[PDB]
């Protein structure tokens, strides 16, 4: 197992060759932004609710950036569901719907960014994310739009044309790519329940669970849907995520302080 042996396989075999795959897996592992936390602010669960949900979270973001480095991604929400409904009724494929959804997450990032601008926190994007390093170094936070960039190359789900990789997946993959220390999803329920809590009671709260236990329990729908949970099981750097209720004052602050509010979902 040498660097010369890896380079020799990389020149002589297909990238599909299991021997090459395994030598590449022994490569060193550099974390690009190891001290940062990725947070997703929900689109339907938070930003679509307006000032009563958003303003307290802006206050928490401003207080947090003193001790914490934050990459803050936005969900899409009800305008994307409207676009998906129109487009799906026309027979358009998942790759066309994917671009429509990104425009809604971009709107939400612009609105959140305008509330944060006087604190120096910018909105960033483009295929390079090139404004992230300097912003994180100087003001300890940046806002980005949460949809992945796949556009027409979006992988479809097994059934239907709704893009399976949306803003939960987009934020998760950025945490995984940057090697961040923590991934927090900010939604509108306290965490995972054995049923979903909006449509049934004696749903029981679950403080901690693995992805395999969620599948084996048959936990369907749920506050995080399965495409992001499968990415989590494959991840190299981010091997658990926390889901918290952003409508509860101070929940994001407390999660960033290491309090176990919400549900922790582990890859294994």
């Amino acid at each position: 197992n040498s660097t010369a042996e890896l380079e020799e396989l990389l020149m002589q075999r297909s990238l599909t060759d299991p021997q090459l795959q395994a030598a590449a897996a022994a490569a060193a592992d550099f974390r690009i932004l190891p001290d940062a936390t990725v947070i997703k602010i929900g689109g339907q669960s938070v930003i679509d609710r307006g000032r009563a949900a958003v303003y307290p979270l802006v206050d928490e973001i401003v207080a947090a950036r003193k001790n914490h480095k934050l990459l803050i991604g936005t969900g899409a929400g009800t305008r994307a569901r409207h676009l998906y409904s129109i487009a799906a009724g026309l027979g358009l494929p998942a790759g066309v719907l994917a671009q429509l959804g990104s425009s809604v997450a971009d709107q939400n990032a612009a609105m959140l960014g305008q509330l944060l601008a006087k604190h120096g926190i910018p909105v960033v994007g483009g295929a390079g994310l090139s404004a992230v390093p300097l912003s994180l170094a100087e003001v300890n936070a940046v806002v980005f739009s949460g949809m992945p960039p796949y556009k027409l190359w979006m992988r479809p789900a097994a059934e239907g044309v709704i893009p399976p990789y949306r803003t939960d997946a987009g934020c998760f993959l950025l945490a995984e790519q940057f090697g961040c220390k923590q991934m927090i999803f900010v939604k509108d329920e306290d965490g995972l329940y054995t049923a979903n809590p909006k449509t049934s009671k004696d749903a029981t709260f679950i403080p901690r669970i693995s992805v395999d236990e969620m599948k084996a329990k048959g936990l369907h729908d749920s506050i995080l849907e399965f495409p992001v949970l499968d990415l989590l099981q494959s991840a190299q750097h981010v091997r658990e995520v926390q889901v918290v209720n952003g409508l509860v004052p101070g929940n994001l602050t407390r999660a960033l302080a290491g309090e176990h509010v919400g549900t922790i979902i582990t890859a294994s």
Partner: protein, 245 residues
């Protein structure tokens, strides 16, 4: 019902990066064959990456970089192959176009001219999936996602070999490698061992909505691409498991 076809008259042709790596000896005959195809088909010609992506993988892995760093670095090399091939076809009205343009303005560009060239890699950038240290969604995979999303009339994969064999015909076990004229993606996905196509190609074929078969042909033999674009069986057919409407 399945989604509509956006560009049902389009033919997509993916040119392997290792065909381009052979230089003028392979590229000039191929350019001449493409020139003769322009009056017969409406073509989206997509290039893969080839050996330079192996070199940037070697450097990036030695530096410890994650798979979301390596994916756009390889995609860059496919873009460069595309610029080279389009330059050779410039006098026929052919240019290279970038990802945003392919995603949103391909229809107008194919109205302006008979063919355009693009990158076969998808714009997964830093959002490539984790699990392997090698980016999974590469040139075969990107070209198939686009062809199927468009509902194109076909996708032909142009390689430096006759098709798929039971073992790498340039590798250690090349002696027991036997040619497969036809296979299914599900049969290929159950095998272990290297293939001339991305393994993620088999996964996106399982969720495909339009393209029923993809042919892999040897672009080092003049005439095979021409024949494949007419449906003639001259390499390996891969059945996707899309069932007819």
């Amino acid at each position: 019902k399945r989604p509509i076809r956006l560009l049902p008259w389009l033919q997509v042709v993916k040119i392997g990066g290792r065909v381009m790596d052979r230089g003028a000896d392979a590229i000039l005959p191929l350019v001449e064959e493409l020139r003769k195809l322009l009056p017969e088909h409406r073509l989206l010609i997509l290039t893969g990456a080839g050996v330079r992506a192996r070199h940037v993988f070697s450097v990036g892995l030695d530096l410890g970089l994650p798979v979301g760093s390596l994916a756009p670095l390889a995609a860059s090399e496919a873009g460069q192959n595309g610029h080279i091939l389009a330059a050779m076809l410039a006098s026929e009205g052919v240019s290279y176009v970038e990802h945003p343009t392919v995603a949103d303005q391909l229809a107008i560009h194919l109205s302006a001219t008979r063919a355009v060239v693009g990158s076969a890699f998808p714009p997964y950038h830093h959002h490539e999936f984790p699990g392997s240290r090698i980016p999974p969604h590469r040139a075969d995979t990107g070209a198939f996602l686009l062809a199927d999303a468009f509902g194109a009339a076909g996708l032909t994969i142009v390689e430096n070999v006759d098709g798929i064999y039971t073992a790498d015909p340039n590798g250690p076990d090349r002696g027991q490698a036997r040619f497969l004229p036809e296979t299914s993606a599900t049969d290929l996905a159950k095998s272990e061992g290297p293939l001339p196509v991305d393994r993620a190609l088999l996964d996106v074929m399982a969720t495909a909505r339009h393209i029923e078969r993809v042919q892999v042909v040897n672009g080092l033999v003049p005439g095979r691409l021409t024949a494949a674009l007419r449906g003639e069986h001259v390499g390996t057919l891969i059945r996707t498991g899309v069932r007819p409407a």
